[PDB]
Amino acid sequence: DKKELFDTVINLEEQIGSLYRQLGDLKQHIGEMIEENHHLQLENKHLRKRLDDTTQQIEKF
Amino acid sequence: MDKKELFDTVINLEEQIGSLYRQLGDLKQHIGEMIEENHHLQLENKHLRKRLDDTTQQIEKF
Amino acid sequence: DKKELFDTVINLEEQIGSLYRQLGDLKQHIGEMIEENHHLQLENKHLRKRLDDTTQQIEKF
Amino acid sequence: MDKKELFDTVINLEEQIGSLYRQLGDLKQHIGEMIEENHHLQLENKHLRKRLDDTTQQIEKF
Numbered sequence: 001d002k003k004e005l006f007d008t009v010i011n012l013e014e015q016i017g018s019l020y021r022q023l024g025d026l027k028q029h030i031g032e033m034i035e036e037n038h039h040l041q042l043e044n045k046h047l048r049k050r051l052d053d054t055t056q057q058i059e060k061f
Numbered sequence: 062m063d064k065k066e067l068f069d070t071v072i073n074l075e076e077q078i079g080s081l082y083r084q085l086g087d088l089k090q091h092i093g094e095m096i097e098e099n100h101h102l103q104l105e106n107k108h109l110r111k112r113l114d115d116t117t118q119q120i121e122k123f
Numbered sequence: 124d125k126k127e128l129f130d131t132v133i134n135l136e137e138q139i140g141s142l143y144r145q146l147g148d149l150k151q152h153i154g155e156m157i158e159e160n161h162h163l164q165l166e167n168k169h170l171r172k173r174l175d176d177t178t179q180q181i182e183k184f
Numbered sequence: 185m186d187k188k189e190l191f192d193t194v195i196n197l198e199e200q201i202g203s204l205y206r207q208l209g210d211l212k213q214h215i216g217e218m219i220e221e222n223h224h225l226q227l228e229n230k231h232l233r234k235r236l237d238d239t240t241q242q243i244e245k246f
Contacts, residue, residue, distance in 0.1 A: 002096055005156075008149060009089045015142055016085060019135065020078045026131060027071045033128075033218060034068060040225035047232035054239045061246075062221075067214045074207060077200065084197060091190045095156060098185075102163035109170035116177045123184075125219055132212045139208060143201045150194045157191060 002093075005092065005096070005149075005152060006089070008145075008152075009085065009092060012142065012145060012149065013082065013085050013089070015138070015145070016078060016082050019138055019142070020075065020082070022131075022135060022138070023071070023075055023078060026128075026135065027068075027075065029128060029131075030068065030071055030215065033215075033222065034064065037064075037218060037222055037225070040222060040229065043229050044225055044232065047229055047236060051232060051236055051239065054236070054243060057243060058239065063214060063217070067211070067218070070207070070211060070214070074204065074211070077204060077207075081197065081200060081204075084193070084200075088190070088193060088197070091186060091193070092153065092156075094186070095160060095190070099156065099160055099163060102160070102167055106163065106166050106170055109167065109174060113170060113174055113177070116174065116181065120177060120180060125216075128215065128219070129212070132208065132215060136205065136208050136212070139201060139205050143198065143205070146194070146198055146201060150191075150198065153191065153194055157187065160187075
């Protein structure tokens with residue numbers, strides 16, 4: 001009927017809004033993971049440089 | 062080593078879903094329109110059959 | 124975790140597949156309504172023409 | 185009186201959703217990749233801190 005079809009369409013709408021919300025959450029968590037990655041790369045760089053410097057220091061004495 | 066490209070992909074996704082919402086709305090509008098059109102045609106043809114019945118009853122009585 | 128995020132993404136996938144299926148049903152019903160419309164328009168045309176012809180017939184006698 | 189235009193709109197919608205599916209898949213792939221990358225970096229930095237600790241224990245003993 002009118003109801004049976006309209007409510008179907010609005011049901012689709014609401015499912016779409018739900019998807020959007022969930023994808024927003026996902027975006028947030030993905031962002032957090034990206035920043036995590038970034039910091040890990042920087043930390044890795046510094047620990048590498050530190051190890052190189054301390055290795056050269058030991059190579060001296 | 063991929064970084065913000067994937068993030069922009071996510072944003073692109075959210076934009077596409079956002080779009081889908083609006084399109085679904087317009088679809089709903091056109092659907093309702095077609096439903097009204099169908100109802101109008103229905104009752105219209107019913108009454109047309111009324112008048113047709115009456116006028117055929119008139120002619121077939123000369 | 125790995126699970127908590129991956130299962131989220133696959134959950135989104137499945138919701139998308141669900142939406143697609145539902146939209147397929149909708150497409151079917153919309154098609155049926157369109158054909159219904161078509162037939163109604165044709166029937167309307169013919170009943171109009173019939174009424175015009177029979178009206179002219181009565182206008183004769 | 186609108187007809188098949190709306191139908192083509194529906195088809196366009198189904199095509200967009202179909203697309204979203206694939207994009208979500210690729211997204212999943214890149215996500216997994218970044219997760220592995222994060223784990224590698226984690227353990228790598230842990231061991232780097234091991235070696236750093238040991239070598240600092242070596243230097244500070246002259």
